[PDB]
Amino acid sequence: LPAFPREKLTLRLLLGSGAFGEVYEGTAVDILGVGSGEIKVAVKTLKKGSTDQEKIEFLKEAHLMSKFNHPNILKQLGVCLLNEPQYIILELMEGGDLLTYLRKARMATFYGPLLTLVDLVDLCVDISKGCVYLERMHFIHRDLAARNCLVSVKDYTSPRIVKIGDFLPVRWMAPESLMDGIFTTQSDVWSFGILIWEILTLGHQPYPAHSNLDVLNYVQTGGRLEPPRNCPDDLWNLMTQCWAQEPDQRPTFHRIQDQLQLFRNFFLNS
Numbered sequence: 001l002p003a004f005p006r007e008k009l010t011l012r013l014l015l016g017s018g019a020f021g022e023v024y025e026g027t028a029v030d031i032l033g034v035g036s037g038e039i040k041v042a043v044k045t046l047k048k049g050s051t052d053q054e055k056i057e058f059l060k061e062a063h064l065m066s067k068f069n070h071p072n073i074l075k076q077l078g079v080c081l082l083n084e085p086q087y088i089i090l091e092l093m094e095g096g097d098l099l100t101y102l103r104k105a106r107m108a109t110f111y112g113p114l115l116t117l118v119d120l121v122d123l124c125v126d127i128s129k130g131c132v133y134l135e136r137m138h139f140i141h142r143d144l145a146a147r148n149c150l151v152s153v154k155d156y157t158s159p160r161i162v163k164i165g166d167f168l169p170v171r172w173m174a175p176e177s178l179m180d181g182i183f184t185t186q187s188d189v190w191s192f193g194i195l196i197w198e199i200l201t202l203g204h205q206p207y208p209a210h211s212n213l214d215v216l217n218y219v220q221t222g223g224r225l226e227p228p229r230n231c232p233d234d235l236w237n238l239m240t241q242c243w244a245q246e247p248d249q250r251p252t253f254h255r256i257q258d259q260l261q262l263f264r265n266f267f268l269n270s
């Protein structure tokens, strides 16, 4: 656990609420080492007056995050858990969540989306690198979706990096998870298929003509999402593999990264 002095942390502004207390955008001095300087951070807080049950759940979240070190996984830079309000200090992803990022790219102008196919393929590749890391660590995510991924830039020109953050969402859940409550790395592969469909559609809601409860049945009955408009067939083929009814027939995250990597190389050669 990376204990950090709260005296070196400034809470600058409110970003949202989340689940335990409030989430702020802040500044942490030398949180990377003694020379580092002032670096922009996001601070997850546990409201003062929280019960022991809430403190234990907050401690569990800090423990979970302390295990990740990957370019495509959100990093916990420090914790301030000795006093109230308790803090979990994270790297600030200035672009915000991927769902909002994708949606704004689509709706900014009728000339076209602010993201191209090669931008969207790079997003898929970057998330799949994160998933390969998680599979290698034996960490089951349970909630892969664009609303849980973050982008490093807010604009659509600068080089960007996407990271997996936030560790029922029926529209993202695998059949076994809906029927038996089974959550494995194979069910995460299902959600990854939904997330790449989110990317290629630029943040459209999965199964738009279905309700949450009709999604529960439609998915158990063999029904899948519609192919995104003009979606390259290699990406649609990969997506349908992710949605195999039986978890054992779905590809591994390492295979998915290879498939995305092959498509990106093939496409760039054209």
Ligand SMILES: Cc1nc([C@](C)(O)CO)sc1-c1cnc(N)c(O[C@H](C)c2cc(F)ccc2N2NC=CN2)c1
Pocket (backbone or CB within 6 Å): 015, 016, 017, 018, 023, 042, 044, 074, 090, 091, 092, 093, 094, 095, 096, 097, 098, 100, 101, 147, 148, 149, 150, 164, 165, 166
């Ligand atoms: C700067 C910034 N803007 C965001 C918006 C409001 O969603 C706009 O895209 S998230 C965000 C933002 C930037 N960097 C973070 N490290 C962050 O982490 C928080 C804990 C978070 C991580 C997630 F994976 C998903 C949602 C959230 N939020 N969102 C609100 C509270 N927690 C949020």
